[PDB]
């Protein structure tokens, strides 16, 4: 009941007590572990509000104070009356920082307290959302000196008035299926790239075309907006040893900004809450460039290195994978765009774990997602036992809007 | 109840019913997942259900469920249990049991081979010397001049827990580790504690970097004894690199036969505490873990120096570069000497085929993603985007405490 986690490379042992404050469910049972599965009313609301306000007032060392009780009372009144309630700016900021803090799959959480929170709950239209998003992008990008941020649009009401950003990230490349069979651009975005055209987008039908924004305000029909190009920082990819690398014509954007998740605070649901940080090198080089269902450029690179691609035993895939990732990091660093390598990020996360166990009694962590997609065992998180559990406030998944939108 | 797993690279979806036959616990609850935790005397009372469940399984596989052969065996086992408090397995049952423990090993990526297991029945063994003999025959048969063959040798089952057979070594073949006074380690740091025990038990340690450890064998709950595997039985492979000639000068070599000897085999409620088993290596076991783990030979830096890599910032990925070259060398060396080895791309590919086939013919394949995914180049292997369900089936291989921690010393 007071759980222990061991690091087998350093024998260090942490004791977890934070898990007892867990609310939501994991997917697993005593008979079956689902750790590798990607996705497993007025009465509901007040306990949720209470739990949150209780942790909020605890966090500011005013647990059981006048302010505390008064606020609990005030929210209780507003719920009974309005069948929902509003967060004070302070609670909203606390909640967003804490959703990040509780993201068990996020390796970058040592940064959690430095999140810049933009309150966009006064937004009413898609044009309004566009403006807030542009502002977020420019602030976050900061001419390459990236800063973490989240922008929070109005909360769900009766689920018929939802704000949604239809893109999965604020900034992604288009994907169009070819007559010749294969795919131009980004295969992950083929269906979305089409719904854009299907709603009016004029695709340049190129390979690295920045997708337009598709913004839904108050449950209305979504609108197309193009992010000003000067706001989209991009990095051309070159290798610091191979000059032929640049002729592959590769580039990536500097700002990773996830826009399709739902932020839950004190039982309230924020269905539009785009958030951003900065990339770990492997995210672009290993998953984005080298996944089969993506840009899949391993073969091409390996050819240009003239490796023996006859037998898998030569490890040419591994050799290329490394070079590609050396290049990504090299390109960002040379162009002064923030990026972290998987060795540094994982080392930082171990330290963050140390801190969290010490000052909070634990840190929910999902090993399947924390371990990088290359060189796993040579990073310190590989031999680190982790406990995975769900705390709130949180970021959750939510259905793609098109599967739901009552037109 | 039906459960689905999706492969997110190919969109292939599979459906698991096999998890319904799951007995043991996972460690997980609805409120906590312990999927990355390494590890999360039995009476007539609980023995007959366990026996019955096994014999049911067994007679189904041979398509004789409910036959007179089936019923008579249940009655036979029952009588023997209430009469003797345990029971004996037939050879057919032993063999079936051992194949299935491998087959149910959720952490094993090489399970495609599970039906080709050579089972040696060592239940007539009574002494340590007898154990040494059986183990030598195992090593020779399994090794087969480099053309490796999967095998398991099974010593007598536990009775009262006070007369256990144990192989004290974690693997039949492993290199000594010696802690030096300056805190440095000579040889394999993973085996220091065990090495010390051997020295204490009278082993004359040559104190080199690659000394093969002696066998420490316990028969029938007696004190363990030391035996030296004949060197001619120990196949080793010097490590060289196909392009780098300085690599051989690092003086590395590894043994060819991976043979795990500290696990417990459970079949129909019976516990086999000494059951050494072997297959062949996946390259990264030696190249990534055995050489490059910080708690192991840790030659990453030395290889990187000789490659003249930019070791100033980690973002040069020098570590990643040296790791690949070291694994290239391991495979190259083994193939050149015609000693069976499999690369991680080949092994994961085969596993996905195995797994898919297991879902069709069996209704599932328990699998521990945390252990199935290779320790380098994870996402460019096909298991990485493969959702997997983990649950525990018997027969099974289980962990057990180290014997030096539990043994009652005779003298
Ligand atoms: C600042 C540097 C950051 C780094 C280096 C980072 C890194 C990562 C990485 C590597 C993953 C694994 C996902 C994958 O492999 O594609 C991840 C997931 C995640 N990150 Fe972070 N992140 C950062 C900032 C943030 C911020 C600011 C937030 C929210 C405020 C956040 C929330 C999340 C969430 C919720 C997930 C899991 C998403 C899911 O379950 O699909 N991250 N992050
Ligand atoms: C024939 C070639 C085989 C290959 C390539 C193979 C591969 C592997 C690998 C790579 C691991 C993970 C080890 C690690 O990285 O730490 C593993 C674990 C395991 N293997 Fe296999 N294996 C083979 C044969 C066998 C055989 C013959 C058995 C038993 C009869 C077996 C039973 C197991 C078990 C029980 C585990 C998990 C042990 C644990 O949970 O600590 N394997 N295997
Ligand atoms: C290969 N992934 C597959 C996949 C599948 C579903 C969702 C995701 C998003 C993970 C995610 C979410 C937010 C992030 C932020 C803020 C920064 C950052 N550097 N990385 C981030 C990654 C990814
Ligand atoms: C460096 N890892 C740490 C670690 C910790 C506990 C146990 C193990 C060995 C797993 C194991 C057991 C049996 C195996 C057989 C028969 C063949 C084979 N190729 N590999 C095998 C691996 C490893
Ligand atoms: C099926 C597989 O478990 C799933 O796609 C996960 C595996 N681990 C991952 N880990 C990270 N960091 N990112 C991912 O997208 C995934 N994918
Ligand atoms: C804590 C962590 O789960 C543990 O060290 C595991 C991780 N996955 C592994 N996977 C393999 N194949 N071998 C291992 O030894 C480990 N170690
Ligand atoms: Zn679990």
Swiss-Prot record, chain B:
Effect annotated for changing residue 281 to F: No decrease in nitric-oxide synthase activity
Binding site for L-arginine: 171, 280-281, 285
Main location: membrane
Keywords tagged on the record: Calmodulin-binding, Cell membrane, Cell projection, FAD, Flavoprotein, FMN, Heme, Iron, Membrane, Metal-binding, NADP, Oxidoreductase, Phosphoprotein, Synapse, Ubl conjugation
PTM notes: Ubiquitinated; mediated by STUB1/CHIP in the presence of Hsp70 and Hsp40 (in vitro).
Disulfide bridges in this chain: none
Assembly and oligomerization: Homodimer. Interacts with DLG4 (via N-terminal tandem pair of PDZ domains); the interaction possibly being prevented by the association between NOS1 and CAPON. Forms a ternary complex with CAPON and RASD1. Forms a ternary complex with CAPON and SYN1. Interacts with ZDHHC23. Interacts with NOSIP; which may impair its synaptic location. Interacts with HTR4. Interacts with SLC6A4. Interacts with VAC14.
Protein name: Nitric oxide synthase 1
Source organism per UniProt: Rattus norvegicus
Included range, full protein: 299 to 718 of 1429
């Amino acid at each position: 009941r007071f759980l222990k986690v061991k690091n087998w490379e350093t024998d260090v042992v942490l004791t977890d007590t934070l898990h007892l404050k867990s609310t939501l469910e994991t997917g697993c049972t005593e008979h079956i572990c689902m750790g590798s599965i990607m996705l497993p009313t007025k009465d509901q609301l007040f306990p949720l509000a209470k739990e949150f306000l209780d942790q909020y007032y605890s966090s500011i060392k005013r647990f059981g104070s006048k302010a505390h009780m008064d606020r609990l009372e005030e929210v209780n009144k507003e719920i009974e009356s309005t069948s929902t309630y509003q967060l004070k700016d302070t609670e909203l900021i606390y909640g967003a920082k804490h959703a990040w803090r509780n993201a068990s799959r996020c390796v970058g959480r040592i940064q959690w307290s430095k999140l810049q929170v933009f309150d966009a709950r006064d937004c009413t239209t898609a044009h309004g959302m566009f403006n807030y998003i542009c502002n977020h992008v420019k602030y976050a990008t900061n001419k390459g000196n990236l800063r973490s941020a989240i922008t929070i649009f109005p909360q769900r009401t009766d689920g018929k008035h939802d704000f949604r950003v239809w893109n999965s990230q604020l900034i992604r490349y288009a994907g169009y299926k070819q007559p010749d069979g294969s795919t131009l651009g980004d295969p992950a975005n083929v269906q979305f790239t089409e719904i854009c055209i299907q709603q009016g987008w004029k695709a340049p039908r190129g390979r690295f075309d920045v997708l337009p924004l598709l913004l839904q305000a108050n449950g209305n029909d979504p609108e197309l907006f193009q992010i000003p190009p000067e706001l989209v920082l991009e990095v051309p990819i070159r290798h610091p040893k191979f000059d032929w690398f640049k002729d592959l014509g590769l580039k990536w954007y500097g700002l990773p900004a996830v826009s399709n998740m739902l932020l839950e605070i004190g039982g309230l649901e924020f269905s539009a809450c785009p958030f951003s940080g900065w990339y770990m090198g492997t995210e672009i080089g290993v998953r984005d460039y080298c996944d089969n269902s993506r840009y899949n450029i391993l073969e091409e690179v390996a050819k240009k290195m003239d490796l023996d691609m006859r037998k898998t035993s030569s490890l040419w895939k591994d050799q290329a994978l490394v070079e590609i990732n050396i290049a990504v990091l090299y390109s960002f660093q040379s162009d002064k765009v923030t990026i972290v390598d998987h060795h540094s990020a994982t080392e930082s996360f171990i330290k963050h774990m140390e801190n969290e166990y010490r000052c909070r009694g634990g840190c929910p962590a999902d090993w399947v997602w924390i371990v990088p997609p290359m060189s796993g065992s040579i990073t310190p998180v590989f031999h680190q036992e982790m406990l995975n559990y769900r705390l709130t406030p949180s970021f959750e998944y939510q259905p793609d809007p098109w599967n739901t939108h009552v037109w």
